[PDB]
Amino acid sequence: LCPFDEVFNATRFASVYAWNRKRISNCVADYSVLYNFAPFFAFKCYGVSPTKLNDLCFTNVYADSFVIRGNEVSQIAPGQTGNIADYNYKLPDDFTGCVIAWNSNKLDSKVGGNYNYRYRLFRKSNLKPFERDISTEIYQAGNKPCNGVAGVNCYFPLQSYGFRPTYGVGHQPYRVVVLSFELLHAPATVCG
Amino acid sequence: QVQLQQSGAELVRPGSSVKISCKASGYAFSNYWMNWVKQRPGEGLEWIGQIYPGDGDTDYNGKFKGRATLTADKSSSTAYMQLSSLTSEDSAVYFCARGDDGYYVYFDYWGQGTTLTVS
Amino acid sequence: EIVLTQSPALMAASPGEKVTITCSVSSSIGSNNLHWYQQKSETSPKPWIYGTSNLASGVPVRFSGSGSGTSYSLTISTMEAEDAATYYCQQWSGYPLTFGGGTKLEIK
C-alpha cells in the first residue's frame, strides 16, 4: 500500500513556496484511501477518470503537498494564472492527475497567528510547470539594484500567510496535495 | 438589517490622544472581522488595521503599526481606533469595514466614516 | 507591498456605451482576491464586484468584471448617470491591503 498515509496525514505540511514533492512508485496504490481520509473541499482530477485511478497503472506518482488559502486553491489547475499558479506552484497545460484540497482551520491556524506558512509574492518570471523556487533574494523591483537589502523599492519575496482560526472561509488554510502520473517507458509499478 | 454606525467627526490638535468608535448593529458583532480604512483627502483609500471582536486579535498595516491601537468591546459592540502623535497627514476620513466571512473576503459593510482634523 | 494602478484617473462616458476600467497589478493576484468598490462622492464605499466577476448585493446587471493574473478589468456595457462614481479595485492576496488609485468615472 503506497504511503498515502504519510502524505495525507502529515503532522505539518510544507509551505507552498517550497512544496515537498514525494515521488511514490514500486507500491500498490489504492485511491479508496483518499475518500475516507478527508472532507475534500475540492477534489478535481484532470485528464483521468476518478474511478479509473484504482484500475490504472503508472510508473511514477508525484504528490505535491502544500498549504494555501481557500481562494488560491482554484489557482491549482492547468490553465490558471494567479499568485500561486504563476509564482509558487504551476501545473502544465496537459496536467494529468488529481488535485486534492481540504480545509485545515482547526489544524493549521493559530489564534495569535500562524506565520510559518509563506508564499512567493514577487518573482521575475512565472514558474515553468512543476518547478520549485526557494531563492529568497530581495526582489529587484526598484530601478536601483537592490543589493540584497529589504525596504522601499526592494521587497522580501516571501510574505507570510498569517492564518488565524477566525479568518474568512476563503482565507482559512487548506492543505492541498496534488497528484501527477508519469507513464514513461519504465516498469509500471503502481496499480490495483 | 445590517449597518455599521460610526462616531462623529472631531478636531484634535497635533497630539497623541484620539478615539474613534464604530457601532455595529444587526449582526453578531464578534463573528465578523472588523478592519479600518483611512482615506486621505484626494487619495485612494488605504488599510489601517484589522481587529477580530471575538477575541481581540489585531492585524495592522506596516506604517500605522504601533502608532494606532485597535480594540473593541463585545458588550457594547463598539470597535475603537486610537491614534498617537497626530500629524496633518493623519487628517483623513476613517472607515470601519467589516471583512466578509464568505469564500470571497471583502469589505461587505462600511461605516459612514469619521473625519479627523489634526490642527 | 503589492501596488495597484488603475488605468484611467478619470473617464468620460455616455449612456448605452461600453467603458472599461483597467486595474493593473504589479504582481499577479488571485481573481478571488481582487474586488471592486464603488465610492460615489463623499459617501461610504460599498462593494460592487467581489472576486472579479461576482457582483455584490443590489449591483446592477450591467456591471461585470473580467481579467485574471496581473491585469484586472471592470466594464459597464451601458453607462447610466447612476453609474458615475469612483471605483477602487482592492487586492487581498498580499496582506497589506492596497486599494487602487481610483478611476473617477464621469459622464461626457
Short mmCIF file of C-alpha atoms in Angstrom, two decimals:
data_model
loop_
_atom_site.label_atom_id
_atom_site.label_comp_id
_atom_site.label_asym_id
_atom_site.label_seq_id
_atom_site.Cartn_x
_atom_site.Cartn_y
_atom_site.Cartn_z
CA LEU A 1 0.00 0.00 0.00
CA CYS A 2 1.52 3.28 -1.15
CA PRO A 3 2.33 5.85 1.56
CA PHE A 4 -0.85 7.85 1.11
CA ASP A 5 -0.89 7.67 4.90
CA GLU A 6 2.28 9.72 5.24
CA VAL A 7 1.30 12.30 2.61
CA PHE A 8 -2.28 12.92 3.69
CA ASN A 9 -1.75 12.51 7.45
CA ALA A 10 1.36 14.68 7.81
CA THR A 11 1.76 16.46 11.14
CA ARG A 12 2.74 19.72 9.42
CA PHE A 13 2.57 20.34 5.69
CA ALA A 14 5.16 22.29 3.76
CA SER A 15 4.78 25.92 2.79
CA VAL A 16 3.70 26.49 -0.79
CA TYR A 17 6.83 28.39 -1.81
CA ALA A 18 8.84 25.25 -1.07
CA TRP A 19 6.40 22.41 -1.66
CA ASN A 20 7.54 18.89 -0.84
CA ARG A 21 7.34 16.52 -3.80
CA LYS A 22 7.02 12.85 -2.89
CA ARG A 23 7.53 10.57 -5.89
CA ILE A 24 5.85 7.28 -4.99
CA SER A 25 6.40 4.12 -7.02
CA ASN A 26 7.11 0.41 -6.59
CA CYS A 27 3.96 0.25 -4.44
CA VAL A 28 0.31 -0.66 -4.82
CA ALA A 29 -1.81 2.49 -4.72
CA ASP A 30 -5.41 2.40 -3.53
CA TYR A 31 -7.45 5.54 -4.10
CA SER A 32 -10.29 4.46 -1.83
CA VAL A 33 -7.93 5.72 0.88
CA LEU A 34 -8.47 9.26 -0.38
CA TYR A 35 -12.24 9.32 0.04
CA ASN A 36 -12.42 8.12 3.63
CA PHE A 37 -9.47 10.18 4.81
CA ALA A 38 -10.50 13.80 4.49
CA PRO A 39 -13.56 16.02 3.78
CA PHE A 40 -12.00 17.18 0.47
CA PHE A 41 -13.26 20.73 -0.03
CA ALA A 42 -12.15 20.38 -3.66
CA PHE A 43 -11.25 17.13 -5.42
CA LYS A 44 -10.66 17.67 -9.12
CA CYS A 45 -8.93 15.21 -11.45
CA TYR A 46 -7.72 16.40 -14.86
CA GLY A 47 -7.36 14.04 -17.79
CA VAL A 48 -8.22 10.97 -15.68
CA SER A 49 -11.40 9.31 -14.54
CA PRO A 50 -11.55 9.49 -10.74
CA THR A 51 -12.83 5.92 -10.94
CA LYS A 52 -10.09 4.62 -13.26
CA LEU A 53 -7.46 5.71 -10.74
CA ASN A 54 -7.90 2.42 -8.88
CA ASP A 55 -7.55 0.27 -12.02
CA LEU A 56 -4.79 2.14 -13.90
CA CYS A 57 -1.01 1.64 -13.85
CA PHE A 58 1.58 4.44 -13.51
CA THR A 59 5.36 4.30 -13.21
CA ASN A 60 5.77 7.44 -11.11
CA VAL A 61 3.15 9.14 -8.95
CA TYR A 62 4.06 12.61 -7.74
CA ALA A 63 2.49 14.01 -4.58
CA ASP A 64 2.92 17.77 -4.21
CA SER A 65 1.81 18.81 -0.73
CA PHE A 66 1.40 22.41 0.39
CA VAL A 67 -0.87 24.77 2.32
CA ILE A 68 -2.75 27.55 0.54
CA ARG A 69 -5.71 29.74 1.42
CA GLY A 70 -9.02 28.58 0.01
CA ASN A 71 -9.26 31.38 -2.53
CA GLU A 72 -5.96 30.18 -4.01
CA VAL A 73 -7.00 26.53 -4.36
CA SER A 74 -8.71 27.34 -7.65
CA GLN A 75 -5.31 28.55 -8.83
CA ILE A 76 -4.03 24.96 -8.66
CA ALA A 77 -5.12 23.71 -12.08
CA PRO A 78 -3.91 23.72 -15.68
CA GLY A 79 -4.72 26.95 -17.47
CA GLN A 80 -4.98 29.03 -14.28
CA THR A 81 -2.84 32.13 -13.68
CA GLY A 82 -2.64 33.99 -10.38
CA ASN A 83 -0.35 34.32 -7.43
CA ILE A 84 0.17 30.65 -6.57
CA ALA A 85 -0.16 29.40 -10.14
CA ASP A 86 2.28 31.89 -11.64
CA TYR A 87 4.81 32.19 -8.84
CA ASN A 88 4.78 29.33 -6.34
CA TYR A 89 3.40 26.17 -7.95
CA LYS A 90 2.35 25.74 -11.58
CA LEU A 91 0.78 22.86 -13.49
CA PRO A 92 1.47 22.04 -17.14
CA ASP A 93 -1.12 22.56 -19.85
CA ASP A 94 -1.95 18.84 -20.09
CA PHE A 95 -1.51 18.02 -16.40
CA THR A 96 -2.88 14.53 -15.75
CA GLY A 97 -3.57 13.94 -12.07
CA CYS A 98 -5.87 14.70 -9.17
CA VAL A 99 -5.83 17.97 -7.22
CA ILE A 100 -7.00 17.32 -3.67
CA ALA A 101 -7.77 20.09 -1.18
CA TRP A 102 -9.35 20.03 2.28
CA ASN A 103 -9.79 22.74 4.89
CA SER A 104 -7.45 22.59 7.88
CA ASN A 105 -8.63 25.50 10.02
CA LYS A 106 -8.56 23.71 13.36
CA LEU A 107 -5.12 22.35 12.49
CA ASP A 108 -3.02 24.90 10.61
CA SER A 109 -4.31 28.19 12.06
CA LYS A 110 -3.18 29.52 15.45
CA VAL A 111 -5.17 32.05 17.47
CA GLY A 112 -2.44 34.68 17.64
CA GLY A 113 -1.31 34.00 14.10
CA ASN A 114 0.47 31.39 12.03
CA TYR A 115 3.43 32.93 10.24
CA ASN A 116 5.09 29.62 9.37
CA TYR A 117 3.35 29.24 6.02
CA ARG A 118 4.66 31.55 3.32
CA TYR A 119 4.24 32.10 -0.39
CA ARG A 120 6.28 33.79 -3.11
CA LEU A 121 4.68 37.18 -3.56
CA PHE A 122 7.16 38.63 -6.07
CA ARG A 123 9.05 36.83 -8.82
CA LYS A 124 10.68 37.96 -12.05
CA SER A 125 9.42 35.11 -14.23
CA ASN A 126 6.36 32.91 -13.91
CA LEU A 127 7.34 29.38 -13.00
CA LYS A 128 7.73 26.75 -15.65
CA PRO A 129 5.36 23.89 -14.83
CA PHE A 130 6.07 21.81 -11.70
CA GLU A 131 9.12 23.92 -10.82
CA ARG A 132 10.22 24.87 -7.32
CA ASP A 133 11.72 28.24 -6.35
CA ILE A 134 13.24 28.74 -2.90
CA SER A 135 15.60 31.61 -3.71
CA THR A 136 14.87 34.44 -1.28
CA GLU A 137 16.98 37.24 -2.75
CA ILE A 138 15.28 40.62 -2.43
CA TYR A 139 13.20 41.38 -5.50
CA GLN A 140 14.87 43.99 -7.73
CA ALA A 141 11.58 45.82 -8.16
CA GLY A 142 13.18 49.24 -7.80
CA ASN A 143 15.32 50.74 -10.53
CA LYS A 144 18.18 50.81 -8.05
CA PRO A 145 19.91 47.42 -7.86
CA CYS A 146 18.54 46.11 -4.60
CA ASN A 147 21.96 44.98 -3.32
CA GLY A 148 20.38 42.37 -1.05
CA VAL A 149 18.51 44.86 1.15
CA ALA A 150 14.83 44.79 2.08
CA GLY A 151 12.95 48.08 2.11
CA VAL A 152 11.19 50.57 -0.10
CA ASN A 153 11.51 49.51 -3.77
CA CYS A 154 13.08 46.23 -2.56
CA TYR A 155 10.68 43.65 -1.15
CA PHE A 156 11.50 40.47 0.71
CA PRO A 157 9.85 37.90 -1.54
CA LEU A 158 8.12 35.60 0.97
CA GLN A 159 5.07 37.16 2.62
CA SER A 160 3.65 35.07 5.43
CA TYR A 161 0.12 33.75 5.13
CA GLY A 162 -0.68 34.62 8.73
CA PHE A 163 -3.54 32.18 9.16
CA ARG A 164 -5.87 32.63 12.13
CA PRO A 165 -8.73 30.35 13.18
CA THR A 166 -11.31 33.10 12.74
CA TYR A 167 -10.33 34.27 9.25
CA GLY A 168 -12.84 34.28 6.43
CA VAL A 169 -13.71 30.94 4.89
CA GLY A 170 -11.69 31.97 1.86
CA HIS A 171 -8.55 32.65 3.88
CA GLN A 172 -8.65 29.62 6.18
CA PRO A 173 -5.75 27.26 5.48
CA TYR A 174 -6.39 24.43 3.05
CA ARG A 175 -3.78 21.69 2.79
CA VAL A 176 -3.52 20.85 -0.90
CA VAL A 177 -2.00 17.56 -2.08
CA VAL A 178 -1.63 17.29 -5.85
CA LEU A 179 -1.04 14.01 -7.66
CA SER A 180 0.74 13.57 -11.01
CA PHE A 181 1.17 10.40 -13.08
CA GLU A 182 4.10 9.82 -15.41
CA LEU A 183 3.76 6.62 -17.50
CA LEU A 184 7.14 6.72 -19.24
CA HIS A 185 8.82 3.66 -20.76
CA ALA A 186 9.54 2.16 -17.36
CA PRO A 187 8.42 -0.83 -15.29
CA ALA A 188 4.97 0.45 -14.32
CA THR A 189 4.95 -0.32 -10.62
CA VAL A 190 1.78 1.42 -9.37
CA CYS A 191 -1.55 -0.35 -9.97
CA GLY A 192 -4.61 -2.10 -8.50
CA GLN B 1 -30.91 44.87 8.81
CA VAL B 2 -27.11 45.23 8.71
CA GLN B 3 -25.37 48.60 9.00
CA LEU B 4 -22.26 49.93 10.72
CA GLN B 5 -22.58 53.23 12.59
CA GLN B 6 -19.66 55.49 13.47
CA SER B 7 -18.86 58.37 15.78
CA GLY B 8 -18.98 61.95 14.60
CA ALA B 9 -16.03 63.95 13.32
CA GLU B 10 -13.68 65.64 15.78
CA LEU B 11 -10.89 68.20 15.62
CA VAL B 12 -7.70 67.40 17.53
CA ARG B 13 -4.52 69.40 17.87
CA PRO B 14 -1.34 67.51 16.92
CA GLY B 15 -1.12 65.13 19.86
CA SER B 16 -1.18 61.52 20.94
CA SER B 17 -4.82 61.11 22.02
CA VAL B 18 -7.84 60.41 19.80
CA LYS B 19 -10.51 57.71 19.93
CA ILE B 20 -12.90 56.84 17.09
CA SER B 21 -15.78 54.45 17.73
CA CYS B 22 -17.61 52.15 15.33
CA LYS B 23 -21.12 50.94 16.17
CA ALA B 24 -22.24 47.59 14.76
CA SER B 25 -25.95 46.76 14.55
CA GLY B 26 -27.96 43.91 13.10
CA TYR B 27 -25.42 41.08 13.31
CA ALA B 28 -23.35 39.19 15.85
CA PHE B 29 -20.50 41.62 16.43
CA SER B 30 -17.86 39.08 17.48
CA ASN B 31 -18.33 36.80 14.48
CA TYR B 32 -17.14 39.08 11.67
CA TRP B 33 -13.71 40.68 11.33
CA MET B 34 -13.52 44.47 11.67
CA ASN B 35 -10.95 46.46 9.72
CA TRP B 36 -10.39 50.20 9.38
CA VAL B 37 -9.71 52.05 6.14
CA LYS B 38 -8.13 55.51 6.04
CA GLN B 39 -8.96 57.71 3.05
CA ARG B 40 -6.62 60.66 2.72
CA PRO B 41 -8.16 63.72 1.04
CA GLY B 42 -7.89 63.32 -2.71
CA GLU B 43 -6.10 59.98 -2.44
CA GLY B 44 -7.06 56.36 -2.83
CA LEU B 45 -8.00 54.64 0.39
CA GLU B 46 -5.53 52.60 2.41
CA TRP B 47 -5.94 49.90 5.03
CA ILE B 48 -5.10 50.68 8.66
CA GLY B 49 -5.63 47.51 10.64
CA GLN B 50 -7.81 44.52 11.41
CA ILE B 51 -9.43 43.60 14.73
CA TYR B 52 -11.46 40.46 15.39
CA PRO B 53 -14.07 41.32 18.05
CA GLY B 54 -14.37 37.68 19.10
CA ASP B 55 -11.02 37.51 20.89
CA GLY B 56 -9.44 40.90 20.19
CA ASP B 57 -6.90 39.67 17.64
CA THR B 58 -5.20 42.56 15.85
CA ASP B 59 -3.51 42.90 12.47
CA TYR B 60 -2.06 46.26 11.44
CA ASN B 61 -0.67 47.83 8.32
CA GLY B 62 3.08 48.35 8.35
CA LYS B 63 3.16 52.13 8.58
CA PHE B 64 0.34 52.51 11.12
CA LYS B 65 1.63 49.56 13.15
CA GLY B 66 2.42 50.53 16.72
CA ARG B 67 1.01 54.01 16.13
CA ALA B 68 -2.71 53.18 16.02
CA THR B 69 -4.14 50.71 18.54
CA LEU B 70 -7.34 48.86 17.59
CA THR B 71 -9.63 47.45 20.35
CA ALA B 72 -13.28 46.51 20.62
CA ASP B 73 -15.78 45.79 23.39
CA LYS B 74 -18.02 42.77 22.91
CA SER B 75 -20.55 44.01 25.48
CA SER B 76 -21.44 47.32 23.81
CA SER B 77 -20.42 46.14 20.31
CA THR B 78 -18.08 49.11 19.84
CA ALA B 79 -14.93 48.95 17.72
CA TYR B 80 -12.37 51.63 18.58
CA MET B 81 -9.31 53.10 16.92
CA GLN B 82 -6.82 55.17 18.91
CA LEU B 83 -4.01 57.04 17.15
CA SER B 84 -0.92 58.75 18.53
CA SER B 85 1.27 61.69 17.54
CA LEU B 86 -1.37 63.15 15.26
CA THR B 87 0.05 64.95 12.24
CA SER B 88 -1.53 66.91 9.41
CA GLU B 89 -1.19 63.78 7.29
CA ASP B 90 -3.40 61.87 9.72
CA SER B 91 -6.34 64.08 8.76
CA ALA B 92 -8.46 61.66 6.78
CA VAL B 93 -11.89 60.06 6.73
CA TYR B 94 -11.65 56.83 8.72
CA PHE B 95 -13.99 54.00 7.77
CA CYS B 96 -14.68 50.85 9.73
CA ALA B 97 -15.18 47.98 7.32
CA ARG B 98 -16.50 44.52 8.14
CA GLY B 99 -14.48 41.95 6.23
CA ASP B 100 -16.80 39.31 4.86
CA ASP B 101 -16.54 35.74 6.12
CA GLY B 102 -17.57 34.20 2.80
CA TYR B 103 -15.47 32.40 0.23
CA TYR B 104 -14.52 35.78 -1.16
CA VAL B 105 -13.24 38.11 1.56
CA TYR B 106 -14.14 41.77 1.11
CA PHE B 107 -15.47 44.82 2.92
CA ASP B 108 -19.15 43.99 2.73
CA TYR B 109 -20.24 46.74 5.14
CA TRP B 110 -18.67 50.10 5.95
CA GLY B 111 -19.12 52.84 8.49
CA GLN B 112 -20.20 56.29 7.39
CA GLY B 113 -16.65 57.45 8.04
CA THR B 114 -15.26 59.83 10.64
CA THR B 115 -13.34 62.95 9.67
CA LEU B 116 -10.21 63.52 11.75
CA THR B 117 -8.76 67.02 11.85
CA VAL B 118 -5.19 67.45 13.10
CA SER B 119 -4.68 71.11 13.94
CA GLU C 1 3.80 45.85 -0.93
CA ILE C 2 1.55 44.91 -3.83
CA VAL C 3 0.90 48.12 -5.75
CA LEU C 4 -2.29 48.67 -7.74
CA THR C 5 -2.60 51.04 -10.69
CA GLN C 6 -5.93 51.85 -12.33
CA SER C 7 -5.72 52.82 -15.98
CA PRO C 8 -7.98 55.91 -16.17
CA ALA C 9 -7.57 58.53 -13.45
CA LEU C 10 -10.85 59.95 -14.74
CA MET C 11 -13.11 58.67 -17.52
CA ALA C 12 -15.65 60.23 -19.83
CA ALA C 13 -18.67 58.12 -20.73
CA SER C 14 -22.08 58.23 -22.37
CA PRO C 15 -25.25 56.17 -21.81
CA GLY C 16 -25.51 52.96 -23.78
CA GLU C 17 -21.74 52.92 -24.29
CA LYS C 18 -19.19 50.41 -23.10
CA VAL C 19 -16.45 51.77 -20.86
CA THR C 20 -13.73 49.69 -19.23
CA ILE C 21 -11.79 50.36 -16.04
CA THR C 22 -8.44 48.57 -16.04
CA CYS C 23 -6.79 47.77 -12.71
CA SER C 24 -3.19 46.74 -13.35
CA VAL C 25 -1.45 44.91 -10.52
CA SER C 26 2.33 44.77 -10.14
CA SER C 27 2.38 41.12 -9.05
CA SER C 28 -0.29 38.69 -10.16
CA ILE C 29 -3.04 38.09 -7.61
CA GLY C 30 -5.82 35.54 -7.47
CA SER C 31 -9.01 36.80 -9.06
CA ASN C 32 -10.83 35.66 -5.93
CA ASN C 33 -8.66 38.12 -4.02
CA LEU C 34 -9.42 41.21 -6.13
CA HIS C 35 -12.58 43.25 -5.56
CA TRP C 36 -14.07 46.49 -6.85
CA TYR C 37 -15.81 49.06 -4.66
CA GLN C 38 -17.94 51.96 -5.84
CA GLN C 39 -17.42 55.21 -3.96
CA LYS C 40 -19.80 57.91 -5.03
CA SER C 41 -18.67 61.36 -3.98
CA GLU C 42 -18.31 61.81 -0.22
CA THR C 43 -20.09 58.57 0.72
CA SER C 44 -19.03 55.30 2.25
CA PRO C 45 -17.84 52.91 -0.47
CA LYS C 46 -19.99 49.83 -0.98
CA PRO C 47 -18.76 46.57 -2.53
CA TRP C 48 -19.54 46.42 -6.22
CA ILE C 49 -17.69 43.45 -7.68
CA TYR C 50 -16.09 40.83 -5.48
CA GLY C 51 -13.92 38.12 -6.96
CA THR C 52 -13.63 39.96 -10.33
CA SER C 53 -16.95 38.59 -11.59
CA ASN C 54 -19.39 38.15 -8.70
CA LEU C 55 -21.43 41.30 -8.19
CA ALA C 56 -22.44 42.23 -4.67
CA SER C 57 -25.97 42.69 -3.38
CA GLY C 58 -28.00 45.28 -5.25
CA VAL C 59 -25.46 45.60 -8.06
CA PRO C 60 -26.98 46.31 -11.49
CA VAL C 61 -26.76 43.52 -14.04
CA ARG C 62 -24.80 45.78 -16.40
CA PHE C 63 -21.64 45.59 -14.29
CA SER C 64 -19.29 42.68 -14.89
CA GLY C 65 -15.62 42.45 -14.05
CA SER C 66 -13.08 40.47 -16.01
CA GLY C 67 -9.44 39.56 -16.17
CA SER C 68 -7.06 37.45 -14.14
CA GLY C 69 -3.38 37.32 -13.34
CA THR C 70 -1.89 40.80 -13.25
CA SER C 71 -4.36 42.83 -15.32
CA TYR C 72 -7.89 43.19 -13.94
CA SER C 73 -10.68 44.99 -15.74
CA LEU C 74 -14.12 46.31 -14.86
CA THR C 75 -16.57 47.01 -17.65
CA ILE C 76 -20.02 48.56 -17.84
CA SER C 77 -21.92 47.82 -21.04
CA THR C 78 -24.09 50.93 -20.68
CA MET C 79 -23.25 53.95 -18.55
CA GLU C 80 -26.24 55.28 -16.67
CA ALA C 81 -25.95 58.56 -14.79
CA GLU C 82 -26.18 56.47 -11.63
CA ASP C 83 -23.01 54.66 -12.72
CA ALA C 84 -20.84 57.77 -12.28
CA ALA C 85 -18.58 57.14 -9.31
CA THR C 86 -15.02 56.34 -8.29
CA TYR C 87 -14.17 52.64 -8.39
CA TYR C 88 -11.39 51.23 -6.20
CA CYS C 89 -10.00 47.82 -7.05
CA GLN C 90 -8.66 46.06 -3.99
CA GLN C 91 -6.32 43.12 -3.52
CA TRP C 92 -6.26 40.79 -0.54
CA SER C 93 -3.70 38.25 -1.74
CA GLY C 94 -0.77 40.27 -0.39
CA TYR C 95 -1.65 41.14 3.15
CA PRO C 96 -1.14 44.93 3.37
CA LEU C 97 -4.32 45.80 1.51
CA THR C 98 -3.70 48.24 -1.32
CA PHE C 99 -6.67 49.94 -2.92
CA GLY C 100 -6.24 51.31 -6.40
CA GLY C 101 -5.72 54.97 -7.10
CA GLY C 102 -9.33 55.07 -8.23
CA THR C 103 -10.97 55.80 -11.57
CA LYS C 104 -13.28 58.79 -11.30
CA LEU C 105 -15.98 57.88 -13.80
CA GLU C 106 -17.81 60.92 -15.19
CA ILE C 107 -20.35 61.38 -17.97
CA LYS C 108 -19.39 63.07 -21.23
#
